[PDB]
Design a protein around this ligand. Structure first.
Ligand SMILES: [Mg+2]
Ligand SMILES: [Mg+2]
Ligand SMILES: [Mg+2]
Ligand SMILES: [Mg+2]
Ligand SMILES: [Mg+2]
Ligand SMILES: [Mg+2]
Ligand SMILES: [Mg+2]
Ligand SMILES: [Mg+2]
Ligand SMILES: [Mg+2]
Ligand SMILES: [Mg+2]
Ligand SMILES: [Zn+2]
Ligand SMILES: [Zn+2]
Lengths: 147, 136, 98, 91, 213, 101
RNA sequence: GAAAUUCUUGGACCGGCGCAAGACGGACCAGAGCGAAAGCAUUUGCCAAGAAUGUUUUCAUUAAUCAAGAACGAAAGUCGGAGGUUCGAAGACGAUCAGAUACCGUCGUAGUUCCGACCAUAAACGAUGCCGACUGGCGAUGCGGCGGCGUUAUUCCCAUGACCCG
């Protein structure tokens, strides 16, 4: 809660050297502690798994999309948002998707995305009726609050 | 404009779509898929009065043109799909039907099968208009 | 057919002999007395795959209940929670035949 | 021996902050401090260590959930539509 | 400024080989001009063909649907896609002072298609009946749709796609349910009203060709 | 004063029914208040079936019909002259009107 | 009624293949059923409740109506959350009219839908308080029960189903 979204420690078996690579992710909704997260392209379809955009069917609520076929995650990762996969196109290998703003966009069907919304929803309620409780919010990340 | 067939051996089929509202009337002649069309003409292209867009003479002036544009391409027989406005709105086919079917059957074609394709909903939404309804 | 599980366990708690718990029903499997073993759907994953090996060595049926061990506590009438029920002697019940 | 008759928990504020800002908050003050039942054990769950980070204490098993409750509104109809698309390919 | 109808070729469309008549009609496609393929924009076409113009003397209130799968050259080859009931019949069969019964069930054949089948059954007015109603109960309805769910799966789980067509060209199922439900309460107007294919298998090429000889 | 025994409808032992829209207007009428005509009709009346049956391919192809179940409100059902008001003494006859013309 | 605001060669309208989403469950549906009233119609499953009839079981007035005090109570309306297809108060606009801030026509927020807390009002009408009997008939229709010629299927027939007469 440096910024307000929960992370996740995911540990992988690295098949090159004898070592264990650690990672980090953004936790979807309903993750246990001890939960075999698979990851790839032949991956079955449930929460926590991360699999390419071109294979999932239409109308599937996703998060943490890569705008480009690899850049390790850049879209829809805030507290309680989700993008929806709209269509596909077998030739030219593209795929439409709608963003949480309302806009739409065409992404090549070779990137990757986790499945499920971002955990941490409903944050915009509970009005900050206090003043210094917004002050302890912006004592963190940065300095612009007393406008 | 080509034809590979022989005349009396068989009849080459096409299919029409007789749309019939209360103010306009389509005739759309396509092929067996329906995906591929042949010709399309409306009532509104021929009569310069919008209060008789769907007079019965305005379907005859376009159906004769369809059977005139199709005899140059070699069609003898037609199926018929008749179709009202449908939906939650009315369902009675207007007057532009029974004088446009006779109007092209008289104009020399071979009428096949006749059916209804009016889109009847199982369970409607709410029709446009109040509880006391469009009163006038 | 839940009624053929809950209405029989109603009669078993009056009629015959039951043993509830874990350490008490592993003694009672080891000593060759148990005839039927019930598990709830939140016995985590492991002792689920250990009871199926003791019962592999004793040839005793292991049934999986639908709900959790709160529902299984109520279905046994009692007020606490229970993970592993073991039935020794039915008496007048016909649970063993379904 | 009731002594507050409506204000509840938010009686700790007082005359401050208005009225419907001390009524919109009673529910979203009650429903974060409550102790839910776990999904592996019984009745020790109120320790939201932070936002979205619900925590046990007999099972010792942290769940990354909603920000003021355990479950949300949307992600249960989501888990049902994901299990639906998951058995809609195989049958 | 150019007529685009000379840029076209007419093809033919066939049927599988448990029917009588092979030819259905002609369907024009553009030439393969640069990139778009005349086999490709023609292969995914669906033909709504009534069964009495596929047989010699059978009923005419039943329709089949046939998609195209493969191009042989002036030859498309077709496969079963589903069955419809005409609005003439169904609306000429539903009338007041009788009881309507519907049902629906899913089934996978031995090679796999995931067929969904629907049905309907109407109760029959007797011979000397003077009581006007002739309604059924509700337990006798539920004990009827239990048999229709027992029979459609039983006639389907143990055969392929080629032989259920020969069990649908006649009314062999509606005859069977009429004579295994005549015991409870006498119904007369029995049909399977829609058969829909959900998930077709892998495109194996010459199972069709086996269906064309 | 009270004019009909049932109040123009069939609500005897329920307390509530659901509403049903008209066709010409949209006035909402409960179901057992409505005037339900049942219109079966050919697609050709009398003289075009001679010119269908000549120009057809098949041997005396039987024509289909057009089964429509209508509804009406009151003031459409009267302004379009289906029903006419009657005297008090000839209200009670609830046999349907005859089928000669 | 007659038209125009409105859309449209960046391809609308219609035709075919597909795909999402959220509502509504016709035709079958009747002066038929249930519920204390409001009210209740897609299939399937689970949890307990209730009428009527049958009864040579049981307890032996335990009952009737009800000041104060209580539960439920369609729509619309309010404060919150998700969800927003279609309709659509307020509003803008095009005609009509002497004038229309109205009916007519295109767009449309609040709402209409779901869960959670409230509010307790209707021509909530059969405009006829609840319990009790009593005093004419005639046909019907619906559950349970009692018999009966006879057809109908089960076939191998007592018995269960469908008509028919009480
Ligand atoms: Mg008066
Ligand atoms: Mg009322
Ligand atoms: Mg229905
Ligand atoms: Mg009082
Ligand atoms: Mg509201
Ligand atoms: Mg609106
Ligand atoms: Mg005005
Ligand atoms: Mg409301
Ligand atoms: Mg409320
Ligand atoms: Mg009272
Ligand atoms: Zn707890
Ligand atoms: Zn009307």
């Amino acid at each position: 809660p440096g910024r307000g979204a929960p992370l996740a420690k995911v540990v992988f078996r690295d098949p090159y050297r004898f070592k264990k690579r650690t990672e980090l992710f953004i936790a979807a909704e309903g993750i246990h502690t001890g939960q075999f997260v698979y990851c790839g392209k032949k991956a079955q379809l449930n929460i926590g798994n991360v699999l390419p955009v071109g294979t999932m069917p239409e109308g599937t609520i996703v998060c943490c999309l890569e705008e480009k076929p690899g850049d390790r995650g850049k879209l829809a990762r805030a507290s309680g948002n989700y993008a929806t996969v709209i269509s596909h196109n077998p030739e030219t290998k593209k795929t439409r998707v709608k963003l949480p703003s309302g806009s739409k966009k065409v992404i090549s069907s070779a990137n990757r995305a986790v499945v499920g919304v971002v955990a941490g929803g409903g944050r915009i309620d509970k009005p900050i009726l206090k003043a210094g409780r917004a002050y302890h919010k912006y004592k963190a990340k940065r300095n612009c609050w007393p406008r | 404009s080509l034809g590979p067939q022989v005349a009396e051996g068989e009849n080459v089929f096409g299919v029409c779509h007789i749309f019939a509202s209360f103010n306009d009337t389509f005739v759309h002649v396509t092929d067996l898929s329906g995906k591929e069309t042949i010709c399309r003409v409306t009532g509104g292209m021929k009569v310069k009065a919008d209060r008789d867009e769907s007079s019965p003479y305005a379907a005859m002036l376009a159906a004769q043109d369809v059977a005139q544009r199709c005899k140059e391409l070699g069609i003898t027989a037609l199926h018929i799909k008749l179709r009202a406005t449908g939906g939650n709105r009315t369902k009675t086919p207007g007057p532009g039907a029974q004088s446009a079917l006779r109007a092209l059957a008289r104009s020399g074609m071979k009428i096949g099968r006749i059916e209804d394709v009016t889109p009847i909903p199982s369970d409607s939404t709410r029709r446009k208009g109040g509880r006391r309804g469009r009163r006038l | 057919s839940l009624e053929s599980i809950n209405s029989r366990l109603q009669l078993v708690m009056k009629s015959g002999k039951y043993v509830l718990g874990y350490k008490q029903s592993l003694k009672m499997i080891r000593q060759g007395k148990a005839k039927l073993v019930i598990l709830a759907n939140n016995c985590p994953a492991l002792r689920k795959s250990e009871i199926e090996y003791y019962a592999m060595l004793a040839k005793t049926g292991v049934h999986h209940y639908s709900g959790n061990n709160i529902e299984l506590g109520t279905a046994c009438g009692k007020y606490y929670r229970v993970c592993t029920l073991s039935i020794i002697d039915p008496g007048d019940s016909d649970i063993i035949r379904s | 021996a009731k002594r507050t008759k409506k204000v509840g928990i938010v009686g700790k504020y007082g005359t401050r902050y208005g009225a419907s800002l001390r009524k919109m908050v009673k529910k979203i003050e009650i429903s974060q401090h409550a102790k839910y039942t776990c999904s592996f054990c019984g009745k020790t769950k109120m320790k939201r260590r932070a936002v979205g980070i619900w925590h046990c204490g007999s099972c010792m098993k942290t769940v990354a959930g909603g920000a003021w409750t355990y479950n949300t509104t949307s992600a249960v109809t989501v888990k049902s539509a994901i299990r639906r698309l998951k058995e809609l390919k195989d049958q | 400024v150019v007529d685009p109808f000379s840029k076209k070729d007419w093809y033919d469309v066939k049927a599988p080989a448990m029917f009588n008549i092979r030819n259905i009609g002609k369907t024009l496609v553009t030439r393969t001009q640069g990139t778009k393929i005349a086999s490709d924009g023609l292969k995914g076409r669906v033909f709504e063909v009534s069964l009495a113009d596929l047989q010699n003397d059978e009923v005419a209130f039943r329709k089949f649907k046939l998609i195209t799968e493969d191009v042989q050259g002036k030859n498309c080859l077709t496969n079963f896609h589903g069955m419809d009931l005409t609005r003439d019949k169904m609306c000429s069969m539903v009338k007041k002072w009788q009881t309507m019964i519907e049902a629906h069930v899913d089934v996978k054949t031995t090679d796999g298609y995931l067929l969904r089948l629907f049905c309907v059954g109407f109760t029959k007015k007797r011979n000397n009946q003077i009581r006007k109603t002739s309604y059924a109960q509700h337990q006798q309805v539920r004990q009827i749709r239990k048999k229709m769910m027992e029979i459609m799966t039983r006639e389907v789980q143990t055969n392929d796609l080629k032989e259920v067509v020969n069990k649908l060209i006649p009314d062999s199922i509606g005859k069977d349910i009429e004579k295994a439900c005549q015991s409870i309460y006498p119904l007369h107007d029995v049909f399977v009203r829609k058969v829909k294919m959900l998930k077709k298998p892998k495109f194996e090429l010459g199972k069709l060709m086996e269906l064309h000889g | 004063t009270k004019k009909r025994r049932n109040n123009g409808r069939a609500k005897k032992g329920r307390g509530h029914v659901q509403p049903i829209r008209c066709t010409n207007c949209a006035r909402c009428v409960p179901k057992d208040k409505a005037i339900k005509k049942f219109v079966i009709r050919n697609i050709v009346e009398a003289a075009a079936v001679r010119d269908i049956s000549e120009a057809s391919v098949f041997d005396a192809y039987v024509l289909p019909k057009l089964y429509v179940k209508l509804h009406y409100c009151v003031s459409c059902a009267i302004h379009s002259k289906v029903v006419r008001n009657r005297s008090r003494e000839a209200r009670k006859d609830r046999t349907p009107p005859p089928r000669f013309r």
